[PDB]
Design a protein around this ligand. Structure first.
Ligand SMILES: O=C(O)CCCC[C@@H]1SC[C@@H]2NC(=O)N[C@@H]21
Ligand SMILES: [Zn+2]
Ligand SMILES: [Zn+2]
Ligand SMILES: [Zn+2]
Length: 115
């Protein structure tokens, strides 16, 4: 089914990569390696969990593992682009402990699939 188009390795404009397995059941499971300069929790793999349906994808990475804890998480909501160079256009929300309660940052990531 469609899951074939998603499963593999992707990268964004910041050099972050993720490896995902997309299940025919809609499940998204993988590992994310963050390389956005200046941000915490770079390099080491963090678990990705998400879902997809039609052209729409969403996934979550909680930025705590055995090597670094950034007291934050990011949720991406995206849409798939088809062939030649497959693409996922996303908007993300990063929720973190701000000092007087949770805070959120927003941004956009474009992922391109590794050939
Ligand atoms: O600094 C943190 O709290 C954890 C690292 C967050 C990295 C962000 S998530 C959205 C954006 N896209 C990336 O690949 N890295 C940054
Ligand atoms: Zn299938
Ligand atoms: Zn499954
Ligand atoms: Zn915390």
């Amino acid at each position: 089914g469609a899951e074939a188009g998603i499963t593999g390795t992707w990268y964004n404009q910041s050099g972050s990569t993720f490896t995902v397995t997309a299940g025919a059941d809609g499940n998204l499971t993988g590992q994310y390696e963050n390389r956005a300069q200046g941000t915490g929790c770079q390099n080491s793999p963090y678990t990705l969990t998400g879902r997809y349906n039609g052209t729409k994808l969403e996934w979550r990475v909680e930025w705590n593992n055995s090597t670094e804890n950034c007291h934050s998480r990011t949720e991406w909501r995206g849409q798939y682009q088809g062939g030649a160079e497959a693409r996922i256009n996303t908007q993300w929300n990063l929720t973190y402990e701000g000092g007087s309660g949770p805070a959120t940052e927003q941004g956009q990531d474009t992922f391109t699939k590794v050939k």
